[PDB]
Amino acid sequence: TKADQEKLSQALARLAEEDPTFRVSTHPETGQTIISGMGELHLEIIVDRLKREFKVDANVGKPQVAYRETITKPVDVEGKFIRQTGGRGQYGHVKIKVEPLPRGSGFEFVNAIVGGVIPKEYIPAVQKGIEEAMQSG
Amino acid sequence: MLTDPIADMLTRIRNATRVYKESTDVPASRFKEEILRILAREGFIKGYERVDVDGKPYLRVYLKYGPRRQGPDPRPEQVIHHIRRISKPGRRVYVGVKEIPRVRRGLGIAILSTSKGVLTDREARKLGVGGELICEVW
Amino acid sequence: PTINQLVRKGREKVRKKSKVPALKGAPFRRGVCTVVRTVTPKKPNSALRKVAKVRLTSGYEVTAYIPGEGHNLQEHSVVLIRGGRVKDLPGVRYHIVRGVYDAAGVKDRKKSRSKYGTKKPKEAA
RNA sequence: UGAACGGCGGCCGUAACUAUAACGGUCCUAAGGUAGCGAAAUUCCUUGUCGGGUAAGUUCCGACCUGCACGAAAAGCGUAACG
RNA sequence: UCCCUGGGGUGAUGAGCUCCGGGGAGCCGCAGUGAACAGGCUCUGGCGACUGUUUACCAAAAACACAGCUCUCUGCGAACUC
RNA sequence: AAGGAGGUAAAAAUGGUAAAAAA
RNA sequence: CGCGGUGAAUACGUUCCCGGGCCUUGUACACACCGCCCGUCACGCCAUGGGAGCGGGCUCUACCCGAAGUCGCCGGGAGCCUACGGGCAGGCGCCGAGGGUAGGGCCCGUGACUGGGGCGAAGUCGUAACAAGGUAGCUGUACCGGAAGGUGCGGCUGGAUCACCUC
RNA sequence: AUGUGGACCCGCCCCUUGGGGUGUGUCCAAAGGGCUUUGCCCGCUUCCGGAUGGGCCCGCGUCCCAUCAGCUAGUUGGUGGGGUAAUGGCCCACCAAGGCGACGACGGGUAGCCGGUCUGAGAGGAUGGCCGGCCACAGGGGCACUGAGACACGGGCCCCACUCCUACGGGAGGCAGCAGUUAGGAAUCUUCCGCAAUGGGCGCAAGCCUGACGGAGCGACGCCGCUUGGAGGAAGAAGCCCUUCGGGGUGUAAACUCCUGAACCCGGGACGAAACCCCCGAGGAGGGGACUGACGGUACCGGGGUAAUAGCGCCGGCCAACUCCGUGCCAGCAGCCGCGGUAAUACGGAGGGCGCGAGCGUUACCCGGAUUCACUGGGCGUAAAGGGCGUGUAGGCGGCCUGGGGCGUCCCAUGUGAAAGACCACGGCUCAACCGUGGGGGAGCGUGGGAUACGCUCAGGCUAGACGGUGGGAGAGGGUGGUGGAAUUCCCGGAGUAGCGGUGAAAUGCGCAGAUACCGGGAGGAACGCCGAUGGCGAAGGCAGCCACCUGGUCCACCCGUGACGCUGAGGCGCGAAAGCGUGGGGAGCAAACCGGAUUAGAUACCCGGGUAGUCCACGCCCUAAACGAUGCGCGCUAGGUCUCUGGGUCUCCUGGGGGCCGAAGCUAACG
């Protein structure tokens, strides 16, 4: 439990302050602070000193990876929000074509109005929910 | 009934002084005689006497006023501005020498009952004897 | 309450509550931390403000803020538990300081260098 | 006429992450299980999922409830005293 | 064991005889209700409320009983029952 | 017939409509 | 759009339909009824009560063992001084810190699960309250309902006016 | 042994808690050392008196939670013992039931207390570190010993941990003394010098220990003083900010000018300390000479002389100070309100200016503004708040008058309140911060006398309060038994037939199996029409046909009685709408829950047909509210107009008690 964690952070508070060397830095995309250093036996024996005289229960795990994702094809669907409620509606039928491109480009969308349908207030917002429904695949 | 005919008197005073009625009555007692004595003795009331009503001893007091001004209504001003009972039957004040009020920083009067009789502020101060702080008037 | 009743009972004194229990008479505590996030103030805002959880050196998980623009902090820093909420982050009590054991203020600051780290802009000219 | 024998549904959708469904639709019948209790002397999957208890716990107490197939006098619930 | 002593009884308001009792010191062993009769205790569930009754010859039980409750039949030649 | 006040009888088929905001 | 030949009916009345104006009035409304506004159920955050119990701090009593020491007594078939009377060493006995056992009492930490409360640019459902809010409101209550709420018995105005009996 | 004396014992005189003497009988002493020796110095023995500190005791004040209400069998008391310097159960024994508590006991959280300290006009709040007094602790606990004094920080014994030394047989140690390490925390220092000065312990002295004390070091932690410069110096250069291209600003600020002269160089150089000491006298008073500095050659005096550090909060109103670009509800500031959502005086930058300056902001803690726990100094008709209403205990307080008391209170004498600080005054260091010295104010309790006005105490008295007597009087004021009619559903009877019912409309419903409607008699319950009201009674909740019984509340007249019997009343007491509950009786009407009907998207609701609990009785329990005059009770006072119910009077009027409205003054923030 992460209660023993900030505890082991005091442990580091006298580990990364006695031997310079190592870097106790946390990966962003995942939890758990990465104990980085220069040596196999290095981290191993520093780990010895842990359960020895600092006594920490941490099933010493494998480092995680920063996983992203994408697609591989042109898709066309109906984003119709045909939903009236109280009378205020809030309904949105959006018609997107989606195109995918190289592993390394960036992010692209286009000021793509078929002529002049969807309001210009959605131009800097209809794409948000696109960029929003993108933080989780 | 009553719990301080004294205060009820000072009250009837306030009554007459406010409602403007040349005189008003208030029952017989030595202490009130002493009080009204002080009042007349310092240019406040208009006088007193040992009267009777229905066969019951009373003490009536006539009281002072001033001139009739114009403009803001005819109401003539008051001389006996206000009085407040200080040493209530729960506020049993016991002033003395170094103590004693200075009533409206100069004028006024501290009515106080002391070892030797009923003295006023300048009086009881001069006498160098204190006691209970009856009321305040100006 | 006629003098009597006031004499018997009394009139109980105000008594505070300390609307900032960093406690110990200690208002500077050694902010460990965990989590960063963002959160927002009421109706017309949206920002960052951390949550630094600190542990002080005697308890409490707080929600340590920061001195605003220009942070690094990662996850230790010794965020100096300070004290003072605002209409934002339902807490903002016990802030962070920069300089402390981490942060040292905005990369280039010209005023609030009393918290915002930066020493004396000695532009060498 | 139900402290008379009895019986006391199903499917479709819907909460601005998700999951849920107070909520609308909908065929059926006489009517669709109210309160309380619930892996029960009732639970098939089951040694359910959780918590405690233990060195370890299909047993046990407590709790969650998709009750295969609790539930109103073939009574429901709970209860100190006896067994 | 020994010293001190209280009241019920009987006789008389006591000697004797009896009943039940209190205190203080002192003696011995492994332990003194010295042997025989003589209860293990507590926590928490389940069902049944309760003492009970029942399958003599495998059952004692959560089954039946029970005080209590509703429901109904009975106008005296009762109704019920043979 | 004046007002003001005190106790008795009257009169709405239905209505859901949001909101950060602009001075 | 403008201009002209001919040439009416009928308005008693304000009973009811439409609206405006003004006054009154009600008000929890204030780019103000195209206003506000409550309660579940929903997502998250924060303490909190409860909860089979676990953890622990203090303290409570009854009892078992019991150091040092004070005190009390003995010094006996014996030890040493004895200035024999005693003394000292020692012997047993009282209180006694401490630990032990069982049962309390109080407090905090706490835990599957569970009630509720707060909060958070806009969720879903209904519209109760504020104009008689479209059923006068509001409450004590007892039964009911998705939820705000409903309703009987009662009470209370902070409820009700063509015009009915007075001041 | 010697015995002025002290100690006990039994008497005795005086006392009055164990104060002093005294008659009888027994016990105790002594240490000697020095030398200038026949004398003294230092010490010794026995007691008395002071000087000085403490022991015990009471008086008194002394945080909070009432969701801490009862506590106690060494417990309250005695006699008789034991012990201490000694009073006392502090402990033994024996014994009689008492000992404290809403004046907050018991419990438990919290805490050293003070002379003082910061703030507020003050009341007071909070506070107690350096210093000065009293307490308590010695790693925790027990514990004695020694002794004039202890339960003894660097003495002893034991248990407990805890750490260390060893050859693992055994043993040691306490920095809450002083410097210094470490854990701890945002943070609290030198492992220093001298006993020269003072002070303590000892020695006849010389002298000796003294991390007491007296000095330097470190940290802007506090307060004080102080240099970075003076003086000339431009319609004002340029450098940079701003612009309407004219300039405005920055700023005499700069530079150039002359002047002085921190730092620093040489020289001399302190006070802080004269006693102790030897010497004449006697070892006394007095007299003389001589020794004695850690700081440090620092202070300071003289001369030579260099211009020689500048920062920190801010510029949206509180709060003094705005212009320019960027940033665009993003990055962000914020103690309050809030400010930015693409021209921000609040972000962020740059010029300027506000503040302060060897310092400024930030947070935390404390007092104030906060009169926002109100004693000065508040409030309860609608903002927060009358207890649903009467009862009564204690408690609180109290009518007119005489005199005694002299408790509260007032007066002056007076003890102490140390010192220090607080104030003024004088002074010391060249000022201040800071320290030297004088004096008064000073709460407060002790003791003396004095006043008696006011509360209270004491005795006597009065009638104006309270109460009683008699006599009339009003009422839906309660407990009980009794009885009248109307009217609703229902039973038998009779007569009649095409519908009624019900509603916004309708329908569920009842109807040719003879209903709704009317006539005859019987059942049965519950509520009282008109009167009757804007009224009456009642402490509130309540009370409604009328008879009778018992029975409280109150009203006026008469002045007949008593003589302050008084107002309120924390708890305790009783009471109580409707609902609701229990054990029984009863049910006409009524009606939630429940069913049907209509209605609407929905109708678990209002509207319609049914129907139950219940609404009734006795008895018991619950005891709640918009119990609403939302206004506690009791007294007296301050205009009157009017509507009315009741009491008395020869009465187109008065007067007592009540019930509505109006409106003086007066009150309110206003409606009122």
Short mmCIF file of all heavy atoms in Angstrom, two decimals, chain H residues 218-232:
data_model
loop_
_atom_site.label_atom_id
_atom_site.label_comp_id
_atom_site.label_asym_id
_atom_site.label_seq_id
_atom_site.Cartn_x
_atom_site.Cartn_y
_atom_site.Cartn_z
P C H 218 32.58 36.50 15.51
OP1 C H 218 33.15 36.39 14.15
OP2 C H 218 32.08 37.80 16.02
"O5'" C H 218 31.40 35.43 15.60
"C5'" C H 218 31.49 34.20 14.92
"C4'" C H 218 30.16 33.51 14.90
"O4'" C H 218 29.82 33.09 16.24
"C3'" C H 218 28.99 34.37 14.47
"O3'" C H 218 28.89 34.44 13.05
"C2'" C H 218 27.80 33.68 15.13
"O2'" C H 218 27.38 32.58 14.35
"C1'" C H 218 28.43 33.14 16.42
N1 C H 218 28.12 33.93 17.63
C2 C H 218 26.92 33.66 18.28
O2 C H 218 26.17 32.81 17.79
N3 C H 218 26.59 34.32 19.41
C4 C H 218 27.43 35.22 19.91
N4 C H 218 27.05 35.86 21.02
C5 C H 218 28.67 35.52 19.27
C6 C H 218 28.99 34.85 18.15
P G H 219 28.18 35.68 12.31
OP1 G H 219 28.47 35.50 10.86
OP2 G H 219 28.56 36.97 12.95
"O5'" G H 219 26.63 35.42 12.55
"C5'" G H 219 26.01 34.26 12.03
"C4'" G H 219 24.58 34.11 12.51
"O4'" G H 219 24.54 33.62 13.87
"C3'" G H 219 23.76 35.38 12.57
"O3'" G H 219 23.30 35.79 11.29
"C2'" G H 219 22.64 35.01 13.54
"O2'" G H 219 21.61 34.31 12.87
"C1'" G H 219 23.35 34.05 14.49
N9 G H 219 23.65 34.66 15.80
C8 G H 219 24.82 35.26 16.21
N7 G H 219 24.76 35.71 17.43
C5 G H 219 23.47 35.41 17.85
C6 G H 219 22.82 35.67 19.08
O6 G H 219 23.29 36.23 20.08
N1 G H 219 21.51 35.20 19.09
C2 G H 219 20.90 34.56 18.04
N2 G H 219 19.63 34.17 18.23
N3 G H 219 21.50 34.31 16.88
C4 G H 219 22.77 34.76 16.85
P A H 220 23.69 37.24 10.74
OP1 A H 220 23.30 37.35 9.31
OP2 A H 220 25.08 37.52 11.16
"O5'" A H 220 22.74 38.21 11.57
"C5'" A H 220 21.35 37.93 11.64
"C4'" A H 220 20.59 39.05 12.29
"O4'" A H 220 21.14 40.32 11.85
"C3'" A H 220 19.12 39.12 11.91
"O3'" A H 220 18.31 38.25 12.68
"C2'" A H 220 18.78 40.60 12.09
"O2'" A H 220 18.49 40.89 13.45
"C1'" A H 220 20.11 41.27 11.72
N9 A H 220 20.14 41.80 10.34
C8 A H 220 20.53 43.08 10.00
N7 A H 220 20.49 43.34 8.72
C5 A H 220 20.05 42.15 8.17
C6 A H 220 19.81 41.79 6.84
N6 A H 220 19.99 42.65 5.83
N1 A H 220 19.38 40.54 6.59
C2 A H 220 19.21 39.71 7.63
N3 A H 220 19.41 39.93 8.92
C4 A H 220 19.83 41.19 9.14
P C H 221 18.13 36.72 12.22
OP1 C H 221 19.31 35.95 12.67
OP2 C H 221 17.72 36.71 10.79
"O5'" C H 221 16.90 36.21 13.09
"C5'" C H 221 15.75 37.00 13.25
"C4'" C H 221 15.41 37.17 14.70
"O4'" C H 221 16.36 36.45 15.52
"C3'" C H 221 15.48 38.59 15.22
"O3'" C H 221 14.34 39.37 14.87
"C2'" C H 221 15.65 38.38 16.72
"O2'" C H 221 14.41 38.04 17.33
"C1'" C H 221 16.56 37.14 16.74
N1 C H 221 18.00 37.49 16.88
C2 C H 221 18.45 38.01 18.09
O2 C H 221 17.64 38.16 19.02
N3 C H 221 19.76 38.33 18.24
C4 C H 221 20.61 38.15 17.23
N4 C H 221 21.89 38.49 17.43
C5 C H 221 20.19 37.62 15.98
C6 C H 221 18.89 37.30 15.85
P G H 222 14.52 40.92 14.51
OP1 G H 222 13.36 41.38 13.71
OP2 G H 222 15.90 41.08 13.99
"O5'" G H 222 14.42 41.64 15.93
"C5'" G H 222 13.29 41.42 16.75
"C4'" G H 222 13.50 41.98 18.13
"O4'" G H 222 14.58 41.27 18.79
"C3'" G H 222 13.93 43.44 18.17
"O3'" G H 222 12.84 44.34 18.02
"C2'" G H 222 14.64 43.54 19.52
"O2'" G H 222 13.69 43.67 20.58
"C1'" G H 222 15.29 42.16 19.63
N9 G H 222 16.72 42.14 19.24
C8 G H 222 17.25 41.60 18.09
N7 G H 222 18.55 41.71 18.01
C5 G H 222 18.92 42.34 19.19
C6 G H 222 20.20 42.72 19.67
O6 G H 222 21.30 42.57 19.13
N1 G H 222 20.13 43.34 20.90
C2 G H 222 18.96 43.57 21.59
N2 G H 222 19.11 44.18 22.76
N3 G H 222 17.76 43.22 21.16
C4 G H 222 17.81 42.61 19.96
P C H 223 12.92 45.50 16.92
OP1 C H 223 11.54 45.86 16.49
OP2 C H 223 13.91 45.04 15.91
"O5'" C H 223 13.58 46.72 17.70
"C5'" C H 223 12.90 47.33 18.79
"C4'" C H 223 13.86 47.87 19.83
"O4'" C H 223 14.72 46.81 20.33
"C3'" C H 223 14.84 48.94 19.38
"O3'" C H 223 14.26 50.23 19.24
"C2'" C H 223 15.92 48.85 20.44
"O2'" C H 223 15.49 49.46 21.66
"C1'" C H 223 15.99 47.34 20.65
N1 C H 223 17.00 46.73 19.76
C2 C H 223 18.35 46.88 20.09
O2 C H 223 18.64 47.49 21.13
N3 C H 223 19.30 46.36 19.29
C4 C H 223 18.94 45.71 18.17
N4 C H 223 19.92 45.21 17.41
C5 C H 223 17.58 45.55 17.80
C6 C H 223 16.65 46.07 18.61
P C H 224 14.72 51.19 18.03
OP1 C H 224 13.78 52.33 17.96
OP2 C H 224 14.93 50.37 16.81
"O5'" C H 224 16.12 51.77 18.53
"C5'" C H 224 16.21 52.47 19.76
"C4'" C H 224 17.63 52.74 20.16
"O4'" C H 224 18.31 51.49 20.45
"C3'" C H 224 18.52 53.40 19.12
"O3'" C H 224 18.29 54.78 18.95
"C2'" C H 224 19.91 53.05 19.63
"O2'" C H 224 20.26 53.83 20.75
"C1'" C H 224 19.68 51.61 20.09
N1 C H 224 19.97 50.66 18.99
C2 C H 224 21.32 50.44 18.72
O2 C H 224 22.15 51.03 19.43
N3 C H 224 21.68 49.60 17.72
C4 C H 224 20.74 48.99 16.99
N4 C H 224 21.15 48.18 16.02
C5 C H 224 19.35 49.20 17.24
C6 C H 224 19.01 50.03 18.23
P G H 225 18.12 55.36 17.46
OP1 G H 225 17.07 56.41 17.47
OP2 G H 225 17.98 54.19 16.56
"O5'" G H 225 19.52 56.04 17.15
"C5'" G H 225 20.19 56.81 18.13
"C4'" G H 225 21.68 56.60 18.05
"O4'" G H 225 22.00 55.23 18.41
"C3'" G H 225 22.29 56.77 16.66
"O3'" G H 225 22.52 58.12 16.30
"C2'" G H 225 23.56 55.94 16.77
"O2'" G H 225 24.55 56.65 17.50
"C1'" G H 225 23.08 54.77 17.63
N9 G H 225 22.63 53.62 16.82
C8 G H 225 21.37 53.10 16.65
N7 G H 225 21.33 52.05 15.86
C5 G H 225 22.66 51.85 15.49
C6 G H 225 23.25 50.88 14.65
O6 G H 225 22.71 49.95 14.04
N1 G H 225 24.63 51.07 14.55
C2 G H 225 25.33 52.07 15.18
N2 G H 225 26.65 52.12 14.99
N3 G H 225 24.79 52.98 15.96
C4 G H 225 23.46 52.81 16.07
P C H 226 22.22 58.61 14.80
OP1 C H 226 22.44 60.08 14.77
OP2 C H 226 20.92 58.04 14.36
"O5'" C H 226 23.35 57.91 13.93
"C5'" C H 226 24.73 58.15 14.19
"C4'" C H 226 25.62 57.35 13.27
"O4'" C H 226 25.60 55.95 13.64
"C3'" C H 226 25.27 57.34 11.79
"O3'" C H 226 25.65 58.53 11.11
"C2'" C H 226 25.99 56.10 11.29
"O2'" C H 226 27.37 56.37 11.09
"C1'" C H 226 25.85 55.16 12.49
N1 C H 226 24.75 54.19 12.30
C2 C H 226 25.01 53.10 11.47
O2 C H 226 26.14 53.00 10.96
N3 C H 226 24.06 52.17 11.23
C4 C H 226 22.86 52.32 11.80
N4 C H 226 21.95 51.38 11.54
C5 C H 226 22.55 53.42 12.65
C6 C H 226 23.51 54.33 12.87
P U H 227 25.16 58.78 9.60
OP1 U H 227 25.10 60.25 9.40
OP2 U H 227 23.96 57.96 9.34
"O5'" U H 227 26.34 58.20 8.71
"C5'" U H 227 27.65 58.76 8.77
"C4'" U H 227 28.58 58.10 7.78
"O4'" U H 227 28.85 56.73 8.19
"C3'" U H 227 28.06 57.95 6.36
"O3'" U H 227 28.12 59.14 5.60
"C2'" U H 227 28.92 56.81 5.82
"O2'" U H 227 30.22 57.28 5.50
"C1'" U H 227 29.01 55.91 7.05
N1 U H 227 27.94 54.88 7.05
C2 U H 227 28.04 53.81 6.17
O2 U H 227 28.98 53.67 5.39
N3 U H 227 27.01 52.91 6.23
C4 U H 227 25.90 52.98 7.06
O4 U H 227 25.05 52.10 7.00
C5 U H 227 25.87 54.11 7.94
C6 U H 227 26.86 55.00 7.90
P U H 228 26.97 59.46 4.53
OP1 U H 228 27.08 60.87 4.09
OP2 U H 228 25.69 58.96 5.10
"O5'" U H 228 27.33 58.52 3.29
"C5'" U H 228 28.67 58.44 2.83
"C4'" U H 228 28.88 57.28 1.90
"O4'" U H 228 28.62 56.03 2.59
"C3'" U H 228 27.95 57.23 0.69
"O3'" U H 228 28.40 58.08 -0.36
"C2'" U H 228 27.97 55.75 0.32
"O2'" U H 228 29.15 55.44 -0.40
"C1'" U H 228 28.07 55.09 1.70
N1 U H 228 26.76 54.65 2.25
C2 U H 228 26.02 53.68 1.58
O2 U H 228 26.34 53.18 0.52
N3 U H 228 24.85 53.33 2.21
C4 U H 228 24.37 53.81 3.40
O4 U H 228 23.29 53.40 3.84
C5 U H 228 25.20 54.79 4.03
C6 U H 228 26.34 55.15 3.45
P G H 229 27.39 58.53 -1.53
OP1 G H 229 26.16 57.69 -1.48
OP2 G H 229 28.18 58.63 -2.78
"O5'" G H 229 26.97 60.01 -1.12
"C5'" G H 229 26.14 60.24 0.00
"C4'" G H 229 26.70 61.31 0.89
"O4'" G H 229 28.03 60.92 1.33
"C3'" G H 229 26.93 62.66 0.25
"O3'" G H 229 25.75 63.43 0.08
"C2'" G H 229 27.94 63.28 1.19
"O2'" G H 229 27.33 63.61 2.43
"C1'" G H 229 28.85 62.07 1.43
N9 G H 229 29.89 61.99 0.39
C8 G H 229 30.08 60.99 -0.53
N7 G H 229 31.08 61.21 -1.34
C5 G H 229 31.59 62.43 -0.94
C6 G H 229 32.68 63.20 -1.44
O6 G H 229 33.44 62.92 -2.37
N1 G H 229 32.85 64.39 -0.74
C2 G H 229 32.06 64.79 0.32
N2 G H 229 32.36 65.97 0.88
N3 G H 229 31.05 64.09 0.79
C4 G H 229 30.87 62.93 0.13
P G H 230 25.64 64.44 -1.16
OP1 G H 230 24.28 64.30 -1.75
OP2 G H 230 26.82 64.24 -2.05
"O5'" G H 230 25.79 65.88 -0.47
"C5'" G H 230 25.48 66.06 0.90
"C4'" G H 230 26.45 66.99 1.60
"O4'" G H 230 27.78 66.39 1.59
"C3'" G H 230 26.63 68.36 0.96
"O3'" G H 230 25.70 69.30 1.45
"C2'" G H 230 28.07 68.73 1.28
"O2'" G H 230 28.18 69.29 2.57
"C1'" G H 230 28.75 67.36 1.30
N9 G H 230 29.37 67.01 0.01
C8 G H 230 29.12 65.85 -0.69
N7 G H 230 29.80 65.75 -1.79
C5 G H 230 30.55 66.91 -1.81
C6 G H 230 31.48 67.35 -2.78
O6 G H 230 31.82 66.78 -3.82
N1 G H 230 32.02 68.58 -2.43
C2 G H 230 31.70 69.30 -1.31
N2 G H 230 32.34 70.47 -1.16
N3 G H 230 30.84 68.90 -0.39
C4 G H 230 30.30 67.70 -0.71
P A H 231 24.56 69.89 0.48
OP1 A H 231 23.58 70.60 1.33
OP2 A H 231 24.09 68.76 -0.37
"O5'" A H 231 25.34 70.92 -0.45
"C5'" A H 231 25.60 72.25 -0.03
"C4'" A H 231 26.78 72.85 -0.75
"O4'" A H 231 27.94 71.99 -0.56
"C3'" A H 231 26.67 72.94 -2.26
"O3'" A H 231 25.89 74.02 -2.74
"C2'" A H 231 28.12 72.99 -2.68
"O2'" A H 231 28.69 74.25 -2.34
"C1'" A H 231 28.69 71.93 -1.75
N9 A H 231 28.52 70.59 -2.35
C8 A H 231 27.71 69.55 -1.94
N7 A H 231 27.78 68.48 -2.70
C5 A H 231 28.67 68.83 -3.69
C6 A H 231 29.17 68.14 -4.81
N6 A H 231 28.85 66.90 -5.16
N1 A H 231 30.05 68.80 -5.58
C2 A H 231 30.41 70.05 -5.27
N3 A H 231 30.01 70.80 -4.25
C4 A H 231 29.13 70.13 -3.49
P G H 232 24.80 73.73 -3.87
OP1 G H 232 23.58 74.48 -3.51
OP2 G H 232 24.75 72.25 -4.04
"O5'" G H 232 25.43 74.30 -5.21
"C5'" G H 232 26.04 75.57 -5.25
"C4'" G H 232 27.10 75.63 -6.33
"O4'" G H 232 28.12 74.64 -6.08
"C3'" G H 232 26.63 75.32 -7.74
"O3'" G H 232 25.96 76.39 -8.37
"C2'" G H 232 27.93 74.91 -8.43
"O2'" G H 232 28.70 76.04 -8.80
"C1'" G H 232 28.65 74.17 -7.30
N9 G H 232 28.44 72.72 -7.39
C8 G H 232 27.66 71.94 -6.57
N7 G H 232 27.67 70.68 -6.92
C5 G H 232 28.49 70.63 -8.04
C6 G H 232 28.88 69.53 -8.85
O6 G H 232 28.55 68.34 -8.72
N1 G H 232 29.73 69.92 -9.88
C2 G H 232 30.16 71.21 -10.11
N2 G H 232 30.98 71.40 -11.15
N3 G H 232 29.81 72.24 -9.35
C4 G H 232 28.98 71.88 -8.34
#
